[PDB]
């Protein structure tokens, strides 16, 4: 009887990811995603389940981890609302329901040093940069696959990007209460977090309401060996699961 806990394989639909230095996958709150049971439904229309079409690993544009990078933030299902048929099932309805299997990728040699904080913050309502009673404009909190780069300059309507305050007024050291995993270049290179549907209602809008938000916050600065490139690619791959939609509708109209 000989096996390994770092060699993991996750097959969803027609996509397959392989890893040999992965950490024990985190199941948020020890609750796997499950379809909405009838005992809690409030809407009357029947739900459609694009089980195989949308529940697959969608690789997002990789990010560049430099010595001065503050972190990155992604909103779901916003991060996948421009991805194939999932985006259409998300727009053409008034609401949607689906889980997420996040998979962050950051590989390096045994000489590099650094630690990334991969945390899922359900209902991550960010703070505006103007204070007082200013709001954050829908055009920014819903970037899409672009995500929010916490090192860039603030624009009118985008929340503040002070990674220290988690963009919402909470300290970085306290985010560990949420389901998270550290990508320690010496021990781990790929993080996995199975995110279920978290909301106060059985079903809610999927275009105007983002249930969870993925954040990759470098805790320890990247210290590359002498003569190596001071950059490492971070590839985020998210796979929906247990997807449901109700009320096929005229396309949801977003700005642009």
């Amino acid at each position: 009887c000989g096996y390994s806990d770092r060699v993991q394989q996750i097959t969803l639909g027609n996509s397959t990811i392989t890893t040999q230095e992965a950490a024990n996958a985190v199941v948020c709150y020890a609750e796997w995603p499950e379809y909405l049971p009838d005992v809690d439904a409030s809407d009357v229309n029947k739900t459609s389940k694009p089980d195989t079409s949308v529940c697959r690993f969608y690789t997002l544009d990789s990010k560049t981890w430099t010595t001065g990078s503050k972190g990155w933030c992604w909103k779901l299902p916003d991060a996948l609302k421009d991805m194939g048929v999932f985006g259409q099932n998300m727009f053409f309805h008034s609401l949607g329901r689906s889980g997420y299997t996040v998979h962050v990728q950051c590989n390096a040699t045994k000489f590099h040093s650094g630690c990334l904080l991969v945390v899922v913050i359900p209902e991550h309502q960010l703070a505006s940069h103007e204070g007082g009673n200013v709001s954050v404009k829908y055009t920014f909190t819903h970037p899409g696959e672009r995500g929010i780069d916490l090192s860039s300059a603030n624009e009118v309507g985008g929340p503040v990007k002070d990674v220290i305050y988690n963009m919402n007024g909470t300290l970085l050291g306290n985010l560990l209460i949420f389901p998270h995993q550290f990508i320690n270049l010496r021990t781990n290179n790929t993080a996995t977090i199975v995110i279920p549907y978290i909301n106060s209602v059985p079903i809610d809008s999927m275009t105007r309401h983002n249930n969870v938000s993925l954040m990759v916050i470098p805790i320890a600065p990247l210290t590359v060996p002498t003569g190596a490139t001071p950059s490492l690619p971070i590839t985020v791959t998210i796979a929906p699961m247990c997807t449901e939609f109700s009320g096929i509708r005229s396309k949801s109209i977003v700005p642009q």
Binding site: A23, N24, V26, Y29, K75, P122, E123, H124, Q125, L126, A127, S128, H129, E130, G131, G132, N133, V134, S135, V136, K137, Y138, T139, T141, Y165, N166, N168, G169, T170, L171, N174, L175, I177, F178, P179, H180, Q181, F182, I183, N184, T187, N188, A191, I193, I198, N199, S200, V201, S205, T207, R208, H209, N210, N211, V212, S213, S252, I253, V254, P255
Partner: protein
Amino acid sequence: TVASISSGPKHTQKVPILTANETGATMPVLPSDSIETRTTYMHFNGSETDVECFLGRAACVHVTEIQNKDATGIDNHREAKLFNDWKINLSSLVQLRKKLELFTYVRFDSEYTILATASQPDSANYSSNLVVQAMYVPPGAPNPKEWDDYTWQSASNPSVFFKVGDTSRFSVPYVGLASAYNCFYDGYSHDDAETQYGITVLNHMGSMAFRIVNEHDEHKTLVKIRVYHRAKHVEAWIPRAPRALPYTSIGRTNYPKNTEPVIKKRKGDIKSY
């Protein structure tokens, strides 16, 4: 309940002190795993650490000031405080708001206590025997415009009559549309480039309009109505990080510019105690 188990010298290949936090798990390492411990008992249940007690104690959550006087010639009454209305929000006082924000979802039937005190800084020979009418306003109920409006009948609007100084005590079942209050709502009420973020149906519970129904005496009685609230049937989900920066608004996690440091800087280097 056993607190610490008896453990002597340990020389084995199982190292409960070594782990990998990269997995995101907090191993329940006990004192018996690092040292030699003796048999001890808890003698403690934790009744005061429950969410029902941590969040379920009566406290002040809003306040206002009004007057009861000869209202003749005051075209704008409500804005002159002939009666004042307050939108129910558990996010205006900070010492309870933080405890409520420690979680993402909270479901509770409420308990309210409306504290009014009579007073007369100006020349006034006595403090009247007032009878304050406290009124609940559900979404749609006619937001009254004058102290003598057609609303105070309270046929569908709940009303509670009581004298100043003494308080009303009415319970409210959980009035949210969801299964709990959206302590954090990373979502908009609808898709518009000009809508408000966070503050939505889940936030608006109505409002409480304060007044007095007694006809006026000969002087201005500036009444300050302080509202107290206890949470009942409290249930919490999705624990969150403690609040670090203060607030400026209700329901919004927005903070000010150049906020003050929260971490207590050391006196000396990291090696000081």
